[PDB]
Amino acid sequence: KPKPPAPTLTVVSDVATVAMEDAQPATAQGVAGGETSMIAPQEVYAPSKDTAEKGEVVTKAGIPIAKQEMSREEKLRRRRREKERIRKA
Amino acid sequence: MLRKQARQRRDYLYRRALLLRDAEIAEKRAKLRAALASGKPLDPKIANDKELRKDFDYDVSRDIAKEQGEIDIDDEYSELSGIVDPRVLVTTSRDPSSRLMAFSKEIRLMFPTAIRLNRGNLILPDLVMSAQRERLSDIILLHEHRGTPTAITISHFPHGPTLMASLHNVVLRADIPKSIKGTVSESYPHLIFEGFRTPLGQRVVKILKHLFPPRDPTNNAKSGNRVITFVNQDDCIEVRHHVYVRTNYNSVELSEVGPRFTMRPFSITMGTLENKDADVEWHLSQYTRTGRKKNYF
Amino acid sequence: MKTNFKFSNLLGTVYCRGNLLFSPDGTHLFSPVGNRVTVFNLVENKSYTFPFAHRKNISRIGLTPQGNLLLSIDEDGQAILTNVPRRVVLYHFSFKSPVTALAFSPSGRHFVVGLKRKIEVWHVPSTPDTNEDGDLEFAPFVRHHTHMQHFDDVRHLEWSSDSRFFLSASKDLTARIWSLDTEEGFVPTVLSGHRQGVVGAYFSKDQETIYTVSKDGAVFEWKYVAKPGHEDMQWRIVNKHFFMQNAATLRCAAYHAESNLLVAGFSNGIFGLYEMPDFNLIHTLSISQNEIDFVTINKSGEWLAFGASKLGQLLVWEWQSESYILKQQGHFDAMNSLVYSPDGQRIVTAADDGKIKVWDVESGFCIVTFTEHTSGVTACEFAKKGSVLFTASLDGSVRAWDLIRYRNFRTFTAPERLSFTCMAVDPSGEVIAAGSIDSFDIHIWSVQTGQLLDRLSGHEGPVSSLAFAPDGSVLVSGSWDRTARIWSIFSRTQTSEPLQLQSDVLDVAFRPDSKQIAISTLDGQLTFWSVSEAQQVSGVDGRRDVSGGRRITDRRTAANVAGTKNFNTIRYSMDGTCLLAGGNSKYICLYSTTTMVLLKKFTVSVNLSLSGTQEFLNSKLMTEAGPVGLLDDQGEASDLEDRIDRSLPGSKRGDPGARKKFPEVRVSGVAFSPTGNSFCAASTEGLLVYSLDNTVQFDPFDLNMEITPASTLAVLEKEKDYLKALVMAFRLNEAGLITRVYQAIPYTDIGLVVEQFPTVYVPRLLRFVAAQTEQSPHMEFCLLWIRALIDKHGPWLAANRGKVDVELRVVARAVAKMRDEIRRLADENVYMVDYLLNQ
Amino acid sequence: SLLPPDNEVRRKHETLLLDKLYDMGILSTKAKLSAVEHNVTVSAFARRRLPVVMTRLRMAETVQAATKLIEQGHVRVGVEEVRDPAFLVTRNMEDFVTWTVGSKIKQNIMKYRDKLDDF
RNA sequence: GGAGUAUGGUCGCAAGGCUGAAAAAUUGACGGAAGGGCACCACCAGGGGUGGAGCCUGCGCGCGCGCUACACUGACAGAGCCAGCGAGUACUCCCUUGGCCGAGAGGCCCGGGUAAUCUUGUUAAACUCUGUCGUGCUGGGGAUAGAGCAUUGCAAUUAUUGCUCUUCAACGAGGAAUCCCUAGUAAGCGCAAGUCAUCAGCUUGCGUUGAUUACGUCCCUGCCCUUUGUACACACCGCCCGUCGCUACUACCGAUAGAGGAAGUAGGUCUCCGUAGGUGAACCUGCGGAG
């Protein structure tokens, strides 16, 4: 029986995959390969509430909408959806 | 596979015997730990045992863990307690009747993860073989008298205990019309047990509450709308199956949805349904003098 | 298909015990791999393997300074010299003792060799490559001199620059100077005074100072100066200086005399290089944890090549730039499994070292080593997409890597702790099934969800082989309950149809057109079942066809050894017509799935340093104390780390101690190439890639009498009937003639030729234009060919799809090469130029 | 033992050590560290070896005959034949040690039981 | 005498009635729409019960479990001839072969067995074959009834059971409904046991023969769940909707600063030279110049 799984985290950089490749005179990838930056756009930048602006909110779509331009009906519906998630949790 | 079941059952019985001897020693070691913390003087036969002190220095920590409840006892259910959904099949006797087959369906619907199997021509060792071959957690056999059921046999697998019980006052689901009854909801049921206080009562509580899949513990105190009640008086465990709405914060409306039993257990054997020669743990002592006065569970 | 498999390159190991060499140009690196010698071309990324094979492991490599002749010495001194431009075996000749030093003369006429105490200088044989009117002689080597003026092992031999003298460095602590012929002012003098025996004695450029590097870590200069009482001069010692590598002894040193620098590799793996005649430490670093065994230097002087023997660990180091040129590692454990990539350019193998690595088929180098498993890695598998790799292992985790970003996006475990030994994955890439030896249930997770879908059950024993069907509808499990299961998971009913067998199931494989399945049992028999109506349609009893054995520590005759009489792994062809089967035995069988006959049997290794490669061991090696390859000879070792036995008693599967003397021969994994025309097999020596030989074998298709190359070029050049010439060339099946006519017809008549071309020669033509796109620099011509072919024979290929799947796959990867190599650059250039022109 | 008794890493490594030794079959219980004090023993390893464990499983009659039979190569453990008489059989491979494929000892057992199937 | 553990007494507190039966919430209450998953308590295709006559346990002339049938895939008569789980006699009469006698039931003389040894290959039944009957309540069916002979038992009347002759009823596929069932499953068949509860008006095993039709779909009836979480690459999606509560703030209304009512919003290195000081030959620092 192997071992109980204990959490281990690995810090990857933003270098290309030919920095993870082994040492050899030239790469095995082509010219298109070698620009893939080893972390996805979701890890380069993901729009969320912790990185939003002060006046604005971000939706579930990843789009900044401001509380001032949001109407009363959409404010009520966003309050109801957040309260529905809170009731689910 | 069969050699592994036999080997694991033999290892379990040997570990239980070693636990008996180690409990006989560890009742003496818990006096040495309590006297060390509180300073009350202890017995000379305990304080002058060099083997006990020399091994006590290594075996403090499991006694502390058992005091805090951080570890669980060596049991046939503690291996897979809340990790796996226990699958369980309900079967009849050999040539069932129509009311026994409808009753088998009703107590299949009592468990949300159970399945029912047609017996037909199915030899009972091959029934046990197919259960261990499909990794079932429980089998439940039914016996009828004449369209009315008279016995259950709840057997836990791979090598766990049988509880054989005789049924009384069975009021079937299949007697009331379809206008009044309906399709029973299959949600994960709450369970309540009322009146089990002996260690034998906690044994039968364990082998009855490990038939049901484990409830999600995030918001289980308020969610879920279906309850199953095992309450014993005079060691005849009576079971109801209700469905409820919480019509207010102070009141609740119940609705009886399943069959009613008062099953009385008469045999709890440390060994599966095939083993007729398994060592019994308890049996209903009739034809003794005070077997009717003494109440177990 | 044509089952004519010769032996193409070995792969999967980069260096084993032996000497390293550079080409005289400086680009090719000659390294020994067991009993073969790979050539790594480093200027263009390529590699090949010489067609010879020694009976034991390589001891020495030498190379004539012109470049052409290579001379490889096995253990017990059997030598094979070969021509490196035309890769052909030339002469076999046995030095009767184990060669422990070897050096060719820089004039090229002689080579000197040190057999334990002896020193023989031989002539280099005259070869058919160099003479005009010449042939193979019988005994070509002519001995010139023998010198036994010596007392222990000759550890090194180094010629002069004018090739008139040489130096022999010893194990009796004395380097000596020898001549070729009797010179006028010379006596064959000795150079005494050391403490632990010389590693190497080297000349200088102007041959006055000669240096001696010894095992304790000391290098001494020797000059011809007068004795301190002053015709009367003596070879005496002017200064001495010491490498202060603290707790290690140097194992191999080299000295570049044109640039005056000395490199030394030590027992603790940290080498150091020094500008010698003033002894300034240029630098030093640790290339390996274990030790360094063999150092060589470039002829130019700018590259160094180090080899460690206990691991693979071959690395070339460019010292002035301070960077690796290559740092390569072979598997130092048993290669458990392998799979090709669905493109077919690279294969990925998973060993019991804990690492998996992705080798490229051309150039032979590993391109990425995934090292997240903490125990031995069992089966690895791909999806249909080819971008994701799923690997199971004994540490309890089925990991899931993405090969465009090189990170395991998923890891799966079972809730109770298992140790997975086999796994399969749906070709959609969304469901992983895996099975172990500890529990008999078979687990299924989802890739896009991450959590456990189910534990399928119904097996009365541990499940040994899993295979998802290539269309994606049926899992098949095979287990030691003598049973197999057709699991249908993806339907609304989840069902299991059992196939009852006669013994324990060892391997399960599908046909590519999924109607058939072959399951290989423990009796040694293959049974070909149908998956629609679950009935066995065919069967081979294959014990005798694979039984080749008698290991050391085996008290049975090789015919009575049970255990090497089964097929542990089987794979269909990409055609679907021939199985390939390999077990724990010397033979690979290649069966036909229709006619049920063995088409061809192969032998994986001739290497007698492995244990089970001949079924009749000779009685010369049986002393009165057991066999001679069984006595523990660790105590006769000079080094303590070689003398220590840190082995565990009774550990079949790997221990880090790992005595590993005479390992067994077993083929633990086989795989066909998805482009066809090759397969490969993971042996214990390496990873042998077999391939079809079409250029060295005449094989016409359906030939007439009036069809010659002269007649084909006649109807090309005179008559100018291009379709007739091309059909005649494909009918002759000579690749040079086909290339000649294919390039000769014009790019406006391509369409007429393709429109009137025959459909019996269409798939051969598609394979030929795929190869010409991937190889020749006539890219637009071959793309016009491919476009005309698919536009004319469009509905036929889509109607068939199974008879032409490999041709479509190789055409697809040819246009994938042209789609990823040139047009991304063209688009990026035109957008950058448009922006810079728009400021 | 020398760690303090209420320590988390002490409790976790006690359970890990006892579970590892009970899975290898050296200890017969997994609920006492005094088992690793005076019950782990080179004799416990040497009786988890292969000829003694098949003497206990009655595959042979005596450990001498068992070592002779697994030197002649009749015994596989799982799917692979075992020629080494020092292969340590763990508690879950004691359910998989059995005879080899074409074994004359297996033919002898079947000929005794009168189930000699020659197919 | 000290330390524990019990057992039974004694005492003190508990043991004083604005009283007279039938909330929480920034987290809460209830829904709707869309999309999934599952189900012989759903659809679809078939099969089988029960419900008609009689008997009776049980539950509260009425009811339930059953057995046997309505025949031609059959009844009958020969003839073939094949299991498996069992059991069986000591201070005893159990399992019984074979030999006669008897139409039968049975009788009788012996006999093997405390048993893988004898009964028993339990020569079981459906079943297979060659005949007879021919669609007719017929030779399907065999209730009810008469007369006779036997066996168990101290005893057989209200008929224990067994055999023979005779008598030959209903029942022509069960109605509406209602329920169950998907492979060694439905259904037929016998043999054995009687295990501290249940069960002889039966229960539970065990073998034998062994199909049709689904094995798809959420369209109907429902059940569960998503719309929060629980992992990251490819790839895809793109702020679900309503009625109220609670909280914070803002102003309003009107009786006596105030509890309520109603509402809304959330960049000079190196070297040299000339200096001035320092601890003086030198040397150091600072500056001014040239290379």
Chains A & D: contacts with CB separation below 8 Å = 5
Give the integer Cα–Cα distance in Å for C232 and B19: 93
Please indicate if any CB of chain B lies within 8 Å of the CB of C634: no
Give the integer Cα–Cα distance in Å for C17 and C30: 13
Residue C698 structure tokens: 């005449």
Encode C137-161: b = buried (16+ Cβ within 10 Å), e = exposed. eeeebeeeeebeebeebbbbbbbbe
D25 contacts in chain B (CB < 8 Å): none
Give the integer Cα–Cα distance in Å for C581 and C140: 43
C785 CA vs E85 C1’ separation (Å)? 79
**Cβ atoms of residues C464 and C435 within 8 Å:** yes
Give the integer Cα–Cα distance in Å for C363 and A28: 9
Please calculate the CA angle C231-C235-C238 and round it to the nearest 5 degrees: 115
| Cα four-point dihedral sign C824, C826, C827, C831 | positive
Q: Which nucleotides in chain E lie closer than 7 A to a protein CB? A: 3-4, 23-24, 27-30, 37-39, 41-42, 48-50, 57-58, 64-66, 178-189, 196-199, 201-210, 215-217, 221-225, 227-235, 238-245, 265-266
Please calculate the CA angle C149-C146-C134 and round it to the nearest 5 degrees: 165
Please indicate if any CB of chain B lies within 8 Å of the CB of C460: yes
Beta-carbon count within 10 A of C476 CB = 25
Say which residue the tokens 């448009």 belong to.
C834
* Strand E contacts in A 29-68 (CB under 7 A): 40-43, 59-63, 65, 67
Give the integer Cα–Cα distance in Å for C738 and C732: 9
B12 contacts in chain D (CB < 8 Å): none
User: What Cα–Cα distance (Å) separates residue C119 from each residue in C58, C169, C712, D60?
Assistant: 20, 11, 60, 58
Q: What are phi and psi of C555, to 5 degrees?
A: -95, 20
First CA to last CA distance, chain D:
59
Beta-carbon count within 10 A of D108 CB = 12
Residue C253 structure tokens: 């040193």
Give the integer Cα–Cα distance in Å for C684 and C331: 10
Give the integer Cα–Cα distance in Å for C627 and B279: 56
Q: Indicate yes or no: CB of D84 within 8 angstroms of CB of C565.
A: no
C-alpha B225 chain-centroid distance: 23
User: What kind and span of H or E run contains C212?
Assistant: strand C210-214
Residues forming beta bridges with residue C559, ordered by sequence position: none
Residues forming beta bridges with residue C681, ordered by sequence position: C670, C688
C-alpha C52 chain-centroid distance: 14
A76 CA vs E26 C1’ separation (Å)? 15
C651 contacts in chain D (CB < 8 Å): 88
| Cα four-point dihedral sign B280, B285, B287, B290 | positive
* Strand E contacts in B 249-268 (CB under 7 A): 249, 264, 266
Closest CA to C571 of C537, C526, C607: C526
Chains A & C: contacts with CB separation below 8 Å = 83
Q: Indicate yes or no: CB of B58 within 8 angstroms of CB of D34.
A: yes
**3-class DSSP state of C74:** strand
Give the integer Cα–Cα distance in Å for C45 and C67: 20
**3-class DSSP state of C88:** strand
Residue B288 structure tokens: 């003794």
Q: What are phi and psi of C243, to 5 degrees?
A: -70, 130
Resolution of the experimentally solved model in angstroms: 7.1
- Judge whether residue A9 contacts strand E, using its CB and a 7 Å cut-off: no
Give the integer Cα–Cα distance in Å for B106 and B261: 12
Please indicate if any CB of chain B lies within 8 Å of the CB of D13: no
- Judge whether residue B170 contacts strand E, using its CB and a 7 Å cut-off: no
C453 CA vs E6 C1’ separation (Å)? 60
A22 contacts in chain C (CB < 8 Å): 327-329, 357, 365-369
Say which residue the tokens 């969320």 belong to.
A48
How was this structure obtained?
cryo-EM
Please indicate if any CB of chain D lies within 8 Å of the CB of B64: yes
User: What Cα–Cα distance (Å) separates residue D4 from each residue in B57, C527, D1, D33?
Assistant: 10, 61, 8, 14
**Cβ atoms of residues C175 and C218 within 8 Å:** no
Nearest to C394 among A2, A12, A22 (CB): A2
B64 CA vs E3 C1’ separation (Å)? 27
Residues forming beta bridges with residue C526, ordered by sequence position: C520, C540
SS in 3 state form for chain B?
CHHHHHHHHHHHHHHHHHHHHHHHHHHHHHHHHHHHHHCCCCCHHHHCCHHHHHHHCCCCHHHHHHHHCCCCCCCCCCCCCCCCCCCEEEECCCCCCHHHHHHHHHHHHHCCCEEECCCCCCCHHHHHHHHHHCCCCEEEEEEECCCCEEEEEEEECCCCCEEEEECCCCECHHHCCCCCCCCCCCCCCEEEEECCCCHHHHHHHHHHHCCCCCCCCCCCCCCCCEEEEEEEECCEEEEEEEEEECCCCCCCEEEECCCEEEEEEEEEECCCCCCCCCCEEEECCCCCCCCCCCCCC
Nearest to B133 among C415, C416, C460 (CB): C460
DSSP β-ladder status, C505-510 and B236-245: unpaired
User: What kind and span of H or E run contains C744?
Assistant: helix C735-744
**Cβ atoms of residues B254 and B108 within 8 Å:** no
DSSP β-ladder status, C516-521 and C58-63: unpaired
- Judge whether residue B120 contacts strand E, using its CB and a 7 Å cut-off: yes
**3-class DSSP state of C769:** helix
Residues forming beta bridges with residue C411, ordered by sequence position: C399
Q: What are phi and psi of C19, to 5 degrees?
A: -85, 145
CA distance C469 to chain D (A): 25
User: What kind and span of H or E run contains C239?
Assistant: strand C233-242
Beta-carbon count within 10 A of B285 CB = 13
User: What Cα–Cα distance (Å) separates residue C20 from each residue in C95, C295, C306?
Assistant: 20, 7, 8
Give the integer Cα–Cα distance in Å for C74 and D14: 53
Q: Tell me, what amino acid is at B279? A: D
**3-class DSSP state of A75:** helix
**3-class DSSP state of D47:** helix
Q: Which nucleotide is nearest to C412 (CA to C1')?
A: E231
Encode C56-88: b = buried (16+ Cβ within 10 Å), e = exposed. bbbbbbbbbeeebbbbbbbbbbbbbbbbbeeee
DSSP β-ladder status, B114-116 and B88-91: parallel
**Cβ atoms of residues C148 and C117 within 8 Å:** yes
User: What kind and span of H or E run contains C388?
Assistant: strand C388-393
Q: What are phi and psi of C83, to 5 degrees?
A: -90, 120
C-alpha A44 chain-centroid distance: 7
Residue B64 structure tokens: 């502390």
B138 CA vs E9 C1’ separation (Å)? 55
- Judge whether residue B144 contacts strand E, using its CB and a 7 Å cut-off: yes
A3 contacts in chain D (CB < 8 Å): 16
C562 contacts in chain D (CB < 8 Å): 73, 81, 100-103
Give the integer Cα–Cα distance in Å for C792 and C802: 19
Name, in order, each residue with C-beta under 8 angstroms of B293's C-beta and a sequence gap of 6 or more. Answer: none
* Strand E contacts in B 36-95 (CB under 7 A): 40-41, 93-95
Give the integer Cα–Cα distance in Å for B227 and B256: 10
Residue nearest to nucleotide E218 (CA to C1'): C492
User: What Cα–Cα distance (Å) separates residue C785 from each residue in B110, C739, C744, C835?
Assistant: 70, 13, 13, 35
> Residues C173, C179, C183, C186: what is their CA dihedral angle, to the nearest 10 degrees?
-10
Q: Give the mutation candidate from C556, C661, C662 for the D interface (greatest D CB count, under 10 A).
A: C556
Q: At what angle do helices C805-821 and C779-792 cross, to 10 degrees?
A: 140
Closest CA to C189 of C230, C144, C237, C143: C237
Q: At what angle do helices C823-837 and C805-821 cross, to 10 degrees?
A: 20
Cis status of the peptide bond prior to B149, with omega within 30 of 0 = no
Closest CA to C579 of C627, C522, C523, C508: C508
DSSP conformation class of C477: E
Closest CA to B229 of B110, B126, B65, B75: B110
What is the per-residue DSSP string for C652-678? -S--SS---SSPPP---EEEE-TTSSE
What residues 7-26 of chain D have any CB closer than 8 A to a CB of chain A?
16, 19-20, 23
Q: What are phi and psi of C74, to 5 degrees?
A: -80, 180
Q: Which nucleotide is nearest to A12 (CA to C1')?
A: E232
What is the per-residue DSSP string for C536-567? EEEEEE-STTT-----SS--S-TTT--SSSS-
Chains B & D: contacts with CB separation below 8 Å = 50
Give the integer Cα–Cα distance in Å for C665 and C651: 17
CA distance A7 to chain D (A): 15
- Judge whether residue C451 contacts strand E, using its CB and a 7 Å cut-off: yes
User: What Cα–Cα distance (Å) separates residue C420 from each residue in A1, C423, C453, C752?
Assistant: 10, 8, 16, 58
Q: Which nucleotide is nearest to B171 (CA to C1')?
A: E59
CA distance C555 to chain D (A): 6
B62 contacts in chain D (CB < 8 Å): 14, 31-33
**Cβ atoms of residues C541 and C502 within 8 Å:** no
**Cβ atoms of residues C223 and C209 within 8 Å:** yes
User: What Cα–Cα distance (Å) separates residue C408 from each residue in A58, C349, C445?
Assistant: 30, 16, 15
Q: Give the mutation candidate from C438, C507, C652, C664 for the D interface (greatest D CB count, under 10 A).
A: C652
Q: What are phi and psi of B130, to 5 degrees?
A: -65, -30
**Cβ atoms of residues C459 and C417 within 8 Å:** no
Burial environment of residue D51 by CB neighbours within 10 A (0 to 12, 13 to 18, 19 or more): buried
**Cβ atoms of residues C407 and C396 within 8 Å:** no
Strands in C420-425's sheet, in edge-to-edge order, are C420-425, C431-436, C442-446, C452-456
Say which residue the tokens 């291009």 belong to.
C722
